[PDB]
Amino acid sequence: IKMKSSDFLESAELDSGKVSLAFHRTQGLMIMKTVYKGPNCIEHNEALLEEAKMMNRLRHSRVVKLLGVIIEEGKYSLVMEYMEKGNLMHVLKAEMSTPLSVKGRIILEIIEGMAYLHGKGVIHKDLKPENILVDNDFHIKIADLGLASFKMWSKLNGTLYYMAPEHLNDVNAKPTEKSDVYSFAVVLWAIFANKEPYEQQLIMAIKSGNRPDVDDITEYCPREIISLMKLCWEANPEARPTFPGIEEKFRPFYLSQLE
Ligand SMILES: CN1C(=O)[C@@H](NC(=O)c2cc(Cc3ccccc3)on2)COc2ccccc21
């Protein structure tokens, strides 16, 4: 979990807040983001190392790995694995259109990764294209760049279009697995529409049954996927499926008609 800046042979800052792509001696490339600068705390310094070892042990191919933490002379930084193509929305807004087979695979990988997290008792709450990272081979990893699951590191220093209606104007309602199912539905829309969807007048529209316009999807999208996004953004959370439920229907569909 613990790391030093001496371990990094070279680095390079980039802004996608701001991060450093550092080459580690033996492990290779890693992304680095300094959370806060100033004095070294005492009340919460011990917990920040425990919270990192809790996220470090979330080990799945479709989930971003926290590689370590760097604490040195009043600075606090998190170190994750490098994903070469950035985020899903960066990939979707490129010159060339991503094939339907690759989009179908991204969808299945987000399902695999979200079923993993739910099975480990972790609710995402902040699932959006910006938290779906892409490597140079078009395989994805679900991240937590907004620190929604890092409650300690969040205290050391967002998008409403993917947020389920039950959480719009009811911030005390505890987020559930069905909260993420709603967000995934809006991510499905964004994958085939190739853009971000859609304040008080909007939000109140979403609570009454308003959703992103499916007719805005110009490029080809399968009817079973359209049917899946409609079911996942159902206003009632109990009417939505679980990610293992989505997986048992989506995987046979991907393998027969898209792979
Ligand atoms: C350097 N850096 C990071 O290390 C980031 N780590 C994660 O997002 C992360 C998520 C998980 C596992 C995990 C995934 C999904 C839900 C819950 C849990 O493990 N690590 C955090 O802060 C950054 C912010 C911006 C840019 C870069 C970073």
Swiss-Prot record:
Question: Where in the cell does this protein reside?
Answer: Cytoplasm; Cell membrane
Q: What is the effect of changing S16D?
A: Phophomimetic mutant. Significant loss of kinase activity
Provide the binding site for ATP.
L14, D15, S16, G17, K18, V19, K33
Result after altering A190V: In a colorectal adenocarcinoma sample; somatic mutation
Residues annotated with Phosphoserine modification: S11, S16, S149, S154
Q: Which residues form the active site?
A: D126
Name the domain of life this protein comes from: Eukaryota
Outcome following mutation: S149A: Decreases RIPK1 kinase activity
Q: What is the effect of changing S149E?
A: No effect on RIPK1 autophosphorylation
The protein's PTM annotation reads: (Microbial infection) Proteolytically cleaved by S.flexneri OspD3 within the RIP homotypic interaction motif (RHIM), leading to its degradation and inhibition of necroptosis. Cleavage is crucial for limiting TNF-induced apoptosis, necroptosis and inflammatory response. Cleavage abolishes NF-kappa-B activation and enhances the interaction of TRADD with FADD. Proteolytically cleaved by CASP6 during intrinsic apoptosis.
Impact reported for K33A: Abolishes kinase activity
Q: What is the effect of changing V69I?
A: In a colorectal adenocarcinoma sample; somatic mutation
Residues of the Protein kinase domain: 8-254
* Domain notes per entry: The RIP homotypic interaction motif (RHIM) mediates interaction with the RHIM motif of RIPK1. Both motifs form a hetero-amyloid serpentine fold, stabilized by hydrophobic packing and featuring an unusual Cys-Ser ladder of alternating Ser (from RIPK1) and Cys (from RIPK3).
Linked pathology is:
Immunodeficiency 57 with autoinflammation: An autosomal recessive primary immunodeficiency characterized by lymphopenia and recurrent viral, bacterial, and fungal infections. Patients exhibit early-onset inflammatory bowel disease involving the upper and lower gastrointestinal tract, and develop progressive polyarthritis.
Query: What is stated as this protein's family in its record?
Result: Belongs to the protein kinase superfamily. TKL Ser/Thr protein kinase family.
Biological function: Serine-threonine kinase which is a key regulator of TNF-mediated apoptosis, necroptosis and inflammatory pathways. Exhibits kinase activity-dependent functions that regulate cell death and kinase-independent scaffold functions regulating inflammatory signaling and cell survival. Has kinase-independent scaffold functions: upon binding of TNF to TNFR1, RIPK1 is recruited to the TNF-R1 signaling complex (TNF-RSC also known as complex I) where it acts as a scaffold protein promoting cell survival, in part, by activating the canonical NF-kappa-B pathway.
Q: How does it assemble?
A: Homodimer. Interacts (via RIP homotypic interaction motif) with RIPK3 (via RIP homotypic interaction motif); this interaction induces RIPK1 phosphorylation and formation of a RIPK1-RIPK3 necroptosis-inducing complex. Upon TNF-induced necrosis, the RIPK1-RIPK3 dimer further interacts with PGAM5 and MLKL; the formation of this complex leads to PGAM5 phosphorylation and increase in PGAM5 phosphatase activity. Interacts (via the death domain) with TNFRSF6 (via the death domain) and TRADD (via the death domain). Is recruited by TRADD to TNFRSF1A in a TNF-dependent process.
Please identify the protein, giving its name as recorded: Receptor-interacting serine/threonine-protein kinase 1
Can you name the source organism? Homo sapiens (Human)
